[PDB]
From a paper:
Crenactins, restricted to Crenarchaea, are more closely related to actin than bacterial MreB. Actins’ primary function seems to be regulated polymerisation into cytomotive filaments and for this they contain an ATPase that is sensitive to the polymerisation state. The exact biological function of crenactins is currently unknown, however they were found to be located in functional clusters with other genes, including SMC proteins (Structural Maintenance of Chromosomes), highlighting possible roles in DNA dynamics, for example. Here we show the crystal structure of [name] from [name] at 3.2 Å resolution.
The best conditions yielded crystals that belong to space group P41212 with a very long c-axis and diffract to 3.2 Å only, with the additional complication that diffraction is fairly anisotropic perpendicular to the long axis. Since each asymmetric unit in the two forms Natives 1 and 2 contained two monomers, it yielded 4-fold averaging, greatly improving the very poor phases coming from the weak molecular replacement solutions. This enabled automatic model building and manual rebuilding and refinement, using 2-fold non-crystallographic symmetry, to produce a high confidence structure, refined at 3.2 Å resolution with good R-factors and geometry. The structure of [name] shows several loops that are longer than in actin, but overall, [name] is closely related to eukaryotic actin, with an RMSD of 1.6 Å. Although [name] is very closely related to eukaryotic actin in structure, [name]’s sequence is longer than actin’s (432 for [name] vs. 375 for yeast actin) and the extra residues are consumed to make a number of surface loops bigger. This is most pronounced in loops 295–322, which corresponds to a loop in actin that is involved in the formation of double helical filaments and has also been termed the ‘hydrophobic plug’. The crystals of [name] have a very long c axis because they contain essentially infinite helical protofilaments. Eight subunits form a complete turn of 360° over a distance of 419 Å, the length of the unit cell of the crystals. This means that each subunit repeat is 52.4 Å and the angle from subunit to subunit is 45°. The helix is right-handed, as for actin filaments. The [name] crystals contain a protofilament, made out of a single strand of [name] subunits and this leads to an overall protofilament thickness of only 70 Å.
Residue numbers in the entry:
A (entry chain A), B (entry chain B): 5 to 430
Write the structure that this text describes.
């Protein structure tokens, strides 16, 4: 069937923090935290308050559903599982797999269908470029099981940045995509150029980790130790320099211009003091650069530090650059194609979503800008030739891609373990 | 008709790398690679990107049409096809003929005609001397078919080096003509003296493969593995010695005068180091004389080797000299005739296109010179009496050759099977 294919195509982007899902039909994707809450470490008179089915699996998942069992916990550090801390789930790590399985279930679960025609979903799934083969068969297995519980006609799985490309509708480009734990920057010429893939071991999270170590310095060590806390602080105070060293001065001589405060809870309000307005920039710049003495100051001894990690063959570089990285990405393609591929730089993901506060264009930069700056800094030659833009709706990009890709990808194509594309059926 | 014949005569040189094509009217022929892209192994939302018409044949050709589907598949070995790798298409090799047909169509396709009078092209085709009878019947069959899609009045097929004779307008001469895969050297006295035909089994391609192995030694193994890169390197750094050992010693003792760097893509730039500037000469000299311990060093163990191949009756000699081959050619004609056939040495093909870097005539040599030199080396006798020149525009010679030949070659002359000359009509 076909018209069918415009109602009943189902898209599911994973990655780190949220999991965007929903039918081809939504104007936007629903959005769900990428964590599970485990049920063992818990008082009993609230285990009865829990339906017997949900008690079955040691797992609860949901934006509101986990929201409201958070206060009565024993080990919130042991009982809260984040698989895909790094876009990748540790091969054998069982809880991590289980979370994903319920994450997979929950999402499908939100859209039951009354239509008598419905004869299954067409599920498309977006995983990190970083994602190894075992992880594909894993995700394949999950959806395989879940067709006992729901009508699933077919399932496939393209990479995340590929989806952005399909989503943008740009055949040739380099796609740099930052989410929570890392930025995968990946060149596309109709498919993922897998040797040109660079990953950075730093994402939306160092932006928190700098926020968190700033709040302690202002003197809010209370709020600091709560993640939900630092997120909205950072999301709301965070700034990106045009050049940082120039920005710092501009705010040290005119604090007033840059001071801010934001209400977290009707009771709570965080003000960034005249004393510290200038750290607002370390929040933003650290996605893009981490090479300034001022950012080096909080890695001195302070909390979760900046380093390289290794997943597949691939090494996510702790320090490098978005710039140095997009170049290194380019040097790793066919000499033939570097022209048409450096043509088009597309920024997607949460971690690039920064805005300039009205009246601050002076020295604050949005990410498209911060990046172009970085290129002219590095290669006036390239920069000139390059068109860098950011997607509208950075979170939902990888989604829209997944859904178009799921739409037309004809049903005759079977998944051939090694072609790395095509439908599976159960 | 006649003024007709100056508008609508169509020229088609084949051979190994490029196919020069175009109406008699163009100052230069169009140029198009002698390969095809086979469509089975591909991304499917990117064959939605192809005409279903061109999805018809498993084949695309086009200098740009192939260019932009090249990143869609890594290790292009099997998905890319060069028929006439050696100037001949392997007899039954089905895909090689398949390419040829679409190559044949493509070329014609580029010149649509609006004129009411047009009632057919007058097509002339250049093939290697080397080209067996089946291949003439085959190429004849091709154009026979496409006359259903295009207005084709008549067709005929002359040898490559004979076209150069006609193009040069030299009744009596030896034509040495070199492309990618081989140099054919063939004596002309109104006709091509078929017993005088010698082929060298090496062309502009060894100058690449010396480049390729030179590149690895400098330490650019990445770049070396792409054809498009090596070509551009070769073409840009390659040198022809006056005498090689005299040239090496000249660049070992003064590297600076011989170092060079060259921009491949706005990112990559390949420098030939102070250390190796002398290998630039191995690029040049290899077309002409693969007999030096230095060139023998890379045949030692290294990649695609220098050997004898065997086509029709003819053996393409791996190791021989353009000078020794020129002699041997001569020794196979009428003793009566050797005088004014050796009178005139004509140099054609891209493979001879070498230029000397301003201020290097000192020790570097263009191919006219390098050959002349090789003759006074071998027959001081011969040399003196001989005038050796290079065509201007060596790429496009064979082509003007074919158009003049197709121009005046009376239409009453039918293509007989054994006379090996005349028109077919379809
Ligand atoms: N304005 C903003 N500036 C910087 N980062 C942001 C902003 N808004 C949201 N984020 C980041 O969004 C991230 C989560 O987004 P998401 O697209 O789900 O990435 P992933 O799927 O890799 O977890 C968090 O790192 C948070 O830091
Ligand atoms: N400057 C140059 N020096 C030497 N060879 C060149 C140069 N430019 C192009 N070529 C050569 O042109 C050759 C192809 O010539 P072509 O006339 O198409 O022969 P064929 O048709 O037999 O392939 C390639 O070997 C390439 O090396």
């Amino acid at each position: 069937s076909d018209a069918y294919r415009l109602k009943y195509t189902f898209g599911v982007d994973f990655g780190t923090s949220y999991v965007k899902y929903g039918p081809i039909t939504l104007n936007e994707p629903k959005m769900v935290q990428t964590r599970g809450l485990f049920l063992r470490d818990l008082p009993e008179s609230v285990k009865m308050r829990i339906p017997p089915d949900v008690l079955a699996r040691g797992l609860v998942v949901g934006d509101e559903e986990v929201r409201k069992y958070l206060s009565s916990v024993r080990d919130v550090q042991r009982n809260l599982k984040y698989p895909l801390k790094d876009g990748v789930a540790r091969r054998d790590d069982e809880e991590a797999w289980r979370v994903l399985k319920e994450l997979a279930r929950y999402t499908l679960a939100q859209f039951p269908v009354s239509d008598p025609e419905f004869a299954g979903w067409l599920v498309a799934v977006a995983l990190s470029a970083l994602a190894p083969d075992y992880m594909y068969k894993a995700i394949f297995d999950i959806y395989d099981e879940l067709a006992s519980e729901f009508k699933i006609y077919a399932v496939t799985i393209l990479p995340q940045p590929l989806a952005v490309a399909i989503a943008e509708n740009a055949v040739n480009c380099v796609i740099v995509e930052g989410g929570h734990g890392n930025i995968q920057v990946a060149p596309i010429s109709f498919a993922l150029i897998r040797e040109g893939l660079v990953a950075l071991n730093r994402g939306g999270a160092e932006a928190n980790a700098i926020t968190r170590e700033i709040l302690k310095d202002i003197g809010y060590s209370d709020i600091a130790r709560e993640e939900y806390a630092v997120e909205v602080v950072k999301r709301a105070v965070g700034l990106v320099p045009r050049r940082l060293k120039e920005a710092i001065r501009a705010a040290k001589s005119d604090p007033d211009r840059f001071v801010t405060k934001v209400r977290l809870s009707p009771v709570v309000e965080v003000e960034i003091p005249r004393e510290y307005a200038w750290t607002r920039f370390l929040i933003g710049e650290i996605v893009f650069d981490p090479n300034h003495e001022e950012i080096k100051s909080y890695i001195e001894q302070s909390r979760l530090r900046i380093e390289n990690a290794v997943i597949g063959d691939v090494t996510l570089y702790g320090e490098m650059d978005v710039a140095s990285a997009i170049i290194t990405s380019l040097r790793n393609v066919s000499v033939e194609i570097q022209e048409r591929v450096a043509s088009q730089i597309i920024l997607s993901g949460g971690a690039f979503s920064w805005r300039v506060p009205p009246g601050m264009e002076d020295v604050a930069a949005d990410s498209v800008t911060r990046v172009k700056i970085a290129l002219e800094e590095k290669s006036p030659a390239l920069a000139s030739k390059v068109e860098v833009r950011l997607v509208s709706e950075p979170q939902y990009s990888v989604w829209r891609g997944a859904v178009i890709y799921g739409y037309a990808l004809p049903l005759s194509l079977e998944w051939s373990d090694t072609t790395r594309e095509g439908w599976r059926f159960p």
